[PDB]
Design a protein around this ligand. Structure first.
Ligand SMILES: *[C@@H]1O[C@H](CO)[C@@H](O[C@@H]2O[C@H](CO)[C@@H](O[C@@H]3O[C@H](CO)[C@@H](O)[C@H](O)[C@@H]3O)[C@H](O)[C@H]2NC(C)=O)[C@H](O)[C@H]1NC(C)=O
Ligand SMILES: *[C@@H]1O[C@H](CO)[C@@H](O[C@@H]2O[C@H](CO)[C@@H](O[C@@H]3O[C@H](CO)[C@@H](O)[C@H](O)[C@@H]3O)[C@H](O)[C@H]2NC(C)=O)[C@H](O)[C@H]1NC(C)=O
Ligand SMILES: *[C@@H]1O[C@H](CO)[C@@H](O[C@@H]2O[C@H](CO)[C@@H](O[C@@H]3O[C@H](CO)[C@@H](O)[C@H](O)[C@@H]3O)[C@H](O)[C@H]2NC(C)=O)[C@H](O)[C@H]1NC(C)=O
Ligand SMILES: *[C@@H]1O[C@H](CO)[C@@H](O[C@@H]2O[C@H](CO)[C@@H](O)[C@H](O)[C@H]2NC(C)=O)[C@H](O)[C@H]1NC(C)=O
Ligand SMILES: *[C@@H]1O[C@H](CO)[C@@H](O[C@@H]2O[C@H](CO)[C@@H](O)[C@H](O)[C@H]2NC(C)=O)[C@H](O)[C@H]1NC(C)=O
Ligand SMILES: *[C@@H]1O[C@H](CO)[C@@H](O[C@@H]2O[C@H](CO)[C@@H](O)[C@H](O)[C@H]2NC(C)=O)[C@H](O)[C@H]1NC(C)=O
Ligand SMILES: *[C@@H]1O[C@H](CO)[C@@H](O[C@@H]2O[C@H](CO)[C@@H](O)[C@H](O)[C@H]2NC(C)=O)[C@H](O)[C@H]1NC(C)=O
Ligand SMILES: *[C@@H]1O[C@H](CO)[C@@H](O)[C@H](O)[C@H]1NC(C)=O
Ligand SMILES: *[C@@H]1O[C@H](CO)[C@@H](O)[C@H](O)[C@H]1NC(C)=O
Ligand SMILES: *[C@@H]1O[C@H](CO)[C@@H](O)[C@H](O)[C@H]1NC(C)=O
Ligand SMILES: *[C@@H]1O[C@H](CO)[C@@H](O)[C@H](O)[C@H]1NC(C)=O
Ligand SMILES: *[C@@H]1O[C@H](CO)[C@@H](O)[C@H](O)[C@H]1NC(C)=O
Ligand SMILES: *[C@@H]1O[C@H](CO)[C@@H](O)[C@H](O)[C@H]1NC(C)=O
Ligand SMILES: *[C@@H]1O[C@H](CO)[C@@H](O)[C@H](O)[C@H]1NC(C)=O
Ligand SMILES: *[C@@H]1O[C@H](CO)[C@@H](O)[C@H](O)[C@H]1NC(C)=O
Ligand SMILES: *[C@@H]1O[C@H](CO)[C@@H](O)[C@H](O)[C@H]1NC(C)=O
Ligand SMILES: *[C@@H]1O[C@H](CO)[C@@H](O)[C@H](O)[C@H]1NC(C)=O
Ligand SMILES: *[C@@H]1O[C@H](CO)[C@@H](O)[C@H](O)[C@H]1NC(C)=O
Lengths: 433, 122, 433, 122, 433, 122
């Protein structure tokens, strides 16, 4: 037997590489720079060890989404002239009881196109955006932390599906097992040209517009016994949630400099009503019953499963923070998680709108979302949960979030990047002449 | 036709039928990142082709060599290597003996380079 | 017969690729960053199809010249403080009737290095740069749209020749036919490593400092029958045009901040006269006679060729806008195109000067051209025209332009980029042993 | 010496005299524009070398293969091909038959790769 | 005999190429972005010609150190609001006679977060930073030239070692001769993947924290006979110099905008004392005795070696300017160079501190060094000199510097970049069959 | 083992036994600097491999050629070239004639590429 060199053998090993975008009005997650898409080969007899909690595609996607975000906020208006004293009154014109003292009618002096001239303008500011300084005198929430850019009116925040494709010499292994818990050997592996359309949907406490499980609700945690680890629930059947902003906001353009315009809420045409989201009470209840059923396999059949609302912290982590229609909702999901489980109607979630947005947990970078003209309606899919377990025969689960890598860990759990090692040596009766 | 990495679970005898399939796919925010991935693909490909040329295997997919198979590397017989195992299983077995085999191939061809140089001098 | 593989065959396909620089005080087109130059191979029996109207060399050069233009304007003073209220009077000191009301004496409060100190300065502004707010109050035209980046006085606007060189694996084919209409087969093809020195001369209605036709005037249109397409006339002999600004301007530096300085016209030393361009009446008349004679070939011998002036629109398209000496001229060119053709003296074209320049038709990015000290004289070559025809027995041709790709389409018409396909298979009696 | 692409109008017999002239000319934000053109040239060159390698033609400007010329691709005789046509005319005639020829060359080499591999063990 | 082609021969040519980093809280020289380190091959019988005065490793390192310096100053506060009128009084509280008139107490009107609100603040400014306008009115020296970018307090100025590593196909030859004058053949050549840790210590008139000569003091000049060339002296044993700023500074953060903060000296707690550096009188005298002894070899045994202080010019060239502790010192060093040589005590050098730093001799790009809270003490090594000779039987040597390329020429003198030529053709009796 | 460039001071005969050493180290703001240096290393490596391919020397470190030695390039015999001189000394002597030999090697291979091509047609 003599050493024989084979080039092109089907051998790989785990590797980390820079996957490049591909995608099938400008967008924040630019598809113009992403190369156009085109694919899947089944690998019989191949058992591959996956780990969604040590996957580098999630970490590489987090950097890319953030980088795609702030490079789209570079060319457009920096609202440093908006840090002034605001003479804010209360909007009491046709307000409901729920949304009372939530919008402020703030008047301020604005810079004009002409440097020497001054401009006396007014705008409607949400209570969450202005802080009182001691009509009363206010200022914007983030004026002692940073000056911060108006969200560019022509770029879109809508999630567009993006395909992360491995370069030459690398392959993406896709786990086709339908009951995969994110870690361990996957008996059904296939290699894809690159991943499916993964929408970068920003959300908290609820995975919106994601991918549904094939057979049953999938419970996925790094260590199910560790309460400090978040639990990623995935639904086999979506629960649609209907978002709305009933107010008929009017967008008003204020010329704050040469070539710079600031878009302000003029006046609401009609009555002032609170934003809210609707989840079907029957659909949510049956889904939690399915969640509890698969949640008893890790804690026992006799354990008491209790759902409670968020423990506390920032508004971004205590609320179902999301975006659709251009306005950023912060909905109160205490009605979704309030139940104890033992062995036509709708749920209305009162939401709050915010315009100064800091969303990647970075202090010093705010974005001012301009008002959206008209009424905003929104229909999404609750395709999962991010739960947290409290530290007895009763287990309490509270919605989690904040860390945005968990939102994309639920889409890249079945994918794996490997490096092809095509140089192999094996014995043979060959002998070079 | 199985496709790229289609014979990953096949036996090495059957997976050696499709070396060209894997060989041709080793060569071919979204700016320099995508450009440096292309340069890394070229550099990895060129270093594998350099190794083949050093061992006298340039331009070949199956290259029978003059280095004998040390039984310490693997005591298995040909029947249970080319008909019972896959290339992924084999790579795990001889992962640590890879570098000592590479040096043996490198020095063996270097001896043939001077042996044919001396024979041609006559 | 057996298949045999040849590598290195002289076969090419038409392809689009990124060509790089070559060039044999800084300039706007940064040829210092562009590589140095050095090569003429004639291709006998080669007949290649050229198309100047679908040549990607033109579209790449447009992007490159634009990108080089706005790259030299990044390290330059942004004239944001110049958007103030201007109290302007009319310069009536030694004015001629033609220049009555064109120059305005504008005083304004300007910023200083010290933030808390103001500065009452004055400057002579052209009527085309200031717009009146309703001595009377004015403001710069570039203030409700953008802020002008002042052109750096050290970077030059003089067009120096650049060579666009194809990368490895690509070739540039050069049509050496002297009667090429820019389309169809080219009996005389040659390959170059890259092109002749193509000066990015920026002008409208008149191709200045270009390349001359070898034997006869060449009329090149995408299709003559379509009046919506521009007509690129090329002269076999040049018509020189003498440009001048008789005013003796004084450049006055005004310090508007730490670092940043603003260069303003202070006072004109002596008599004030209108800028103009001179074209010899005899030389222009014979050239239009040659233009008509090769223009009757597409419209019949009995047709009446009438030359009228520009229809209407912006000052950039209705006037022969150009730049030499650092000032941007806008010449009427209505005495040039005024004649009807049936089957020592000079023409003086009154020119107007602007300092706020929107050059590449973009809106929202302007430039302030600082005043040029002294008297500007300029001698150029009219090496072509950009005519437009309008929809009887007579045809009216008016000067066109605006789209600046036509200016460099007149220099890149004979050039073509191809991709070398060196791998070829052919049959031979040879067999592999 | 005609120069680069000088024999483009020559007959294919005469144009094959100067394959090395074209072969050596295929290899050699504004910095990125030049830099991406360099990487494109390298990987375009390497894909053509890889094709020659898998046909057993690596390191050869003219390579003889074991694939017979099917008359369906071109029925013209040997005399009216190497003395009457140019390489540009020829490429346009077999353009649609190029890919099926490329597959035949790849299949003929891996057959030879194993037939020599099997015979070398005797 | 027949030509035989050898690939991989050990042949190199001298070449210039781009070397990259290697490095074993952020720093100005961004070694985090630089690759990690790891290798010593001795080249017997190899005699290579080295030239430290035409070594492109020096010119590349100068560009990189400058480029890394102004790269860490991009995400830092631009002190445009600091150009205001300063009403300055003299700090006379617990002042000493040496420090009389050096520190000034300047009050000024400053911005706040809110644009419409001002801020009456004060700061202690050094006399070298403020210039008087004709309590009295002053303004910062960096205001009729540019605006200073305040040094970010988290980015450190401490020089950490960096390794300049040659790319593939290039080698770095290291001259291991211990008596190398920086020019001519080196009998002991070795190749490295890259160099030792070269700290980019920026200083003038004294090479601090450098590399020591192995056996004797080395005098390396481009040519000794030319007085216009600097003399690079290298010590075999280090002379330690103890730097101190006895003042107990207070760093007072002044919020000058949304985000942006300006750190100012508030009040110094206790006695005011002059900054100074201490060099041992015996250790310096013995070192100058060694410097003279190897300096007589180029000027004769009977010559009189006289050491005088700096001739004149900027404070950066006339003083031993350096930086350690975050403050930039400018020490007199006139007691160091004051002696004539014929064939427990310390030397205290009074130092002056600036906060507005023009570091790379560039004009129009300054930096404000924020005050360091507390008392700064600093111990470093004098490992060389930068002397200048002036055009009798006596020679006068004055300290030089300014050009920072001489500082890193004393570290890269033994290194050399060569380009490997692996293709070689030689005759052999062998013939191709 | 001497290491990279270790045989630089060795004689030409002794330094030609370590060609695999130097061969394998020819291949392996502030991001383009690293990236453009990597692309230049690949381009240089491919240009030297291309030269070997057109001389018939592809995949070989010592390549026997058919070009005779003119002795106008170097009158020294083998004894004083392969046992006294080093490769650095030798390179400085035939540097003038390097491009003359490089053209003869290319010309000889092209003639040989066809004399073998015409031989298979019988
Ligand atoms: C989850 O996905 C759904 C649909 O896949 C998203 O709803 C869609 O959101 C887009 C963007 O806001 C809507 O487009 C807009 O429509 C309005 C009215 O036609 C138009 O005025 C706008 O210019 C824009 O075209 C789209 O209509 C809407 N589809 C629905 C509600 O059925 C939803 O936003 C996603 N949720 C996320 C990303 O959190
Ligand atoms: C067409 O080309 C001609 C020459 O080929 C251009 O005329 C030249 O323009 C340059 C730039 O303005 C002149 O250089 C300047 O000369 C003055 C003389 O006082 C000097 O003070 C400046 O510092 C600068 O060096 C050059 O003299 C001039 N040559 C002639 C003969 O007039 C013309 O501008 C081009 N027309 C275009 C580009 O539209
Ligand atoms: C020459 O090198 C010496 C040491 O090799 C340098 O002295 C060191 O300088 C650093 C930076 O200032 C000191 O670190 C600092 O220490 C203080 C101690 O209170 C701490 O508060 C700071 O946060 C920082 O960590 C270090 O202590 C100091 N070491 C000694 C022994 O003095 C010296 O600065 C260099 N001289 C140059 C570069 O000119
Ligand atoms: C906008 O500016 C106006 C005028 O500068 C402010 O009105 C004055 O405010 C000052 C405050 O000190 C009073 O003393 C004056 O009596 C006010 N009126 C006039 C005519 O000057 C107004 O308060 C500013 N608004 C905001 C929101 O800052
Ligand atoms: C520059 O600013 C000054 C004031 O800062 C202007 O002077 C004022 O002019 C108005 C007339 O519109 C008077 O009512 C004020 O009393 C003036 N203030 C003074 C003199 O302190 C001056 O007009 C400005 N100059 C320009 C050219 O706009
Ligand atoms: C363009 O031509 C006109 C007329 O031919 C020139 O105007 C003459 O200029 C000279 C010198 O300044 C005067 O002596 C004449 O009196 C002018 N004549 C008229 C009718 O105005 C003008 O200078 C020329 N401009 C150029 C060559 O740039
Ligand atoms: C800060 O600004 C105030 C005013 O805004 C200055 O106080 C003025 O001082 C001048 C003397 O030059 C007096 O004539 C004015 O009456 C003052 N105005 C007031 C008190 O409102 C003060 O001097 C400035 N401080 C500094 C340090 O520049
Ligand atoms: C607005 O209403 C809220 C709640 O009723 C109250 O706290 C606040 O003081 C009010 N502000 C004004 C300006 O009326
Ligand atoms: C996931 O499945 C693997 C294999 O069955 C198992 O080892 C691991 O413990 C599971 N993880 C959890 C959190 O249950
Ligand atoms: C959310 O709603 C629940 C029930 O209506 C309530 O207990 C809770 O206070 C609400 N959240 C906040 C932040 O007020
Ligand atoms: C998988 O293994 C079985 C076991 O014999 C074999 O029959 C089959 O061909 C294998 N599949 C592939 C794709 O090699
Ligand atoms: C085979 O390998 C063993 C170690 O695995 C080694 O000791 C022995 O020398 C090797 N035999 C040969 C012939 O190289
Ligand atoms: C100043 O010139 C303008 C035209 O630029 C004219 O409208 C205005 O009447 C003039 N004013 C005078 C002559 O007083
Ligand atoms: C240009 O000339 C060629 C050559 O005769 C011809 O085929 C083509 O139609 C002409 N194009 C136009 C627009 O006349
Ligand atoms: C062009 O064709 C003629 C006639 O066939 C031939 O003699 C000549 O060599 C050809 N030119 C080239 C460059 O091959
Ligand atoms: C303050 O110090 C300066 C020198 O910095 C001096 O010229 C001035 O006279 C001093 N003023 C006093 C002592 O009142
Ligand atoms: C440095 O020493 C070398 C070795 O003798 C010598 O050739 C060279 O001239 C010296 N240079 C100077 C400047 O003395
Ligand atoms: C240096 O030269 C000596 C004498 O010729 C030789 O023995 C030794 O091997 C050489 N060193 C190297 C590294 O070639």
């Amino acid at each position: 037997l003599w050493v024989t060199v084979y080039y092109g053998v089907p051998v790989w090993k785990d590797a980390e590489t820079t996957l490049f975008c591909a995608s099938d009005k400008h967008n924040v997650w630019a598809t113009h720079a992403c190369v156009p898409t085109d694919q899947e080969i089944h690998l019989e007899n191949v058992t591959e060890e996956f780990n969604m909690w040590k996957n580098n595609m999630v970490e590489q996607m987090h950097t890319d989404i953030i980088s795609l975000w702030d490079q789209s906020l570079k060319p457009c208006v920096k609202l440093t002239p908006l840090c002034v004293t605001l003479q804010c009154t209360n909007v009491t014109n046709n307000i409901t009881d729920d949304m009372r003292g939530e919008l402020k009618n703030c008047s301020f002096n604005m810079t004009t196109e002409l440097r020497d001239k001054k401009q006396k303008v007014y705008s409607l500011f949400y209570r969450l955006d202005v802080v009182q300084i001691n009509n009363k005198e206010y200022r914007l929430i983030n004026c002692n932390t940073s000056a911060c850019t108006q969200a560019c009116p022509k770029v879109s925040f809508e999630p567009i599906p993006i395909h992360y494709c491995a370069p030459a010499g690398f392959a993406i292994l896709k786990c086709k097992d339908k009951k995969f818990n994110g870690t361990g050997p996957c008996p059904s592996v296939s290699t894809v040209q690159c991943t499916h359309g993964i929408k970068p949907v920003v959300s908290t406490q609820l995975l919106l517009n994601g991918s549904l499980a094939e057979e049953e609700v999938m419970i996925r945690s790094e260590n199910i016994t560790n309460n400090a680890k978040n639990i990623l629930v995935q639904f086999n059947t979506p629960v649609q949630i209907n978002c709305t902003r009933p107010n008929n906001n009017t967008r008003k353009s204020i010329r704050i400099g040469p070539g710079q315009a600031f878009y302000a809420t003029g006046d609401i045409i009609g009555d002032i009503r609170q934003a809210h989201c609707n989840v079907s009470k029957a659909t949510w209840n049956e889904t939690l019953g399915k969640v509890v059923k698969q949640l008893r396999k890790h804690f026992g059949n006799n354990t008491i499963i209790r759902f409670a609302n968020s423990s506390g912290g920032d508004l971004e982590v205590t609320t179902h923070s999301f975006n659709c229609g251009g306005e950023f909702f912060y909905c109160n999901t205490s009605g979704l998680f309030n139940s104890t489980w033992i062995s036509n109607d709708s749920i209305t979630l009162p939401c709050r709108i915010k315009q100064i947005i800091n969303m990647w947990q970075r202090i010093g970078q705010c974005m001012y979302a301009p008002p959206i003209q008209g009424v905003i309606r929104c229909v999404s899919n609750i395709t999962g949960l991010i739960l947290t377990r409290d530290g007895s025969t009763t287990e309490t689960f509270r919605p989690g979030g904040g860390d945005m890598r968990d939102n994309w860990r639920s889409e890249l759990y079945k994918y794996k990047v490997v490096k092809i090692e095509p140089l192999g040596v094996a014995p043979t009766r060959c002998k070079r002449r | 036709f199985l496709g790229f990495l289609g014979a990953a679970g096949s036996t090495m005898g059957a997976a050696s039928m499709t070396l060209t399939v894997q060989a041709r796919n080793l060569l071919s925010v979204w700016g320099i990142k995508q450009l440096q991935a292309r340069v890394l693909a070229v550099e990895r490909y060129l270093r594998d082709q350099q190794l083949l040329g050093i061992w006298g295997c340039s331009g070949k997919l199956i290259c029978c060599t003059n280095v004998p198979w040390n039984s310490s590397w693997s005591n298995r017989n040909l029947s249970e290597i080319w008909d019972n195992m896959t290339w992924l299983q084999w790579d795990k077995e001889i992962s640590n003996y890879t570098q000592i085999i590479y040096g043996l191939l490198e020095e063996s061809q270097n001896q043939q380079e001077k042996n044919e140089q001396d024979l041609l001098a006559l």
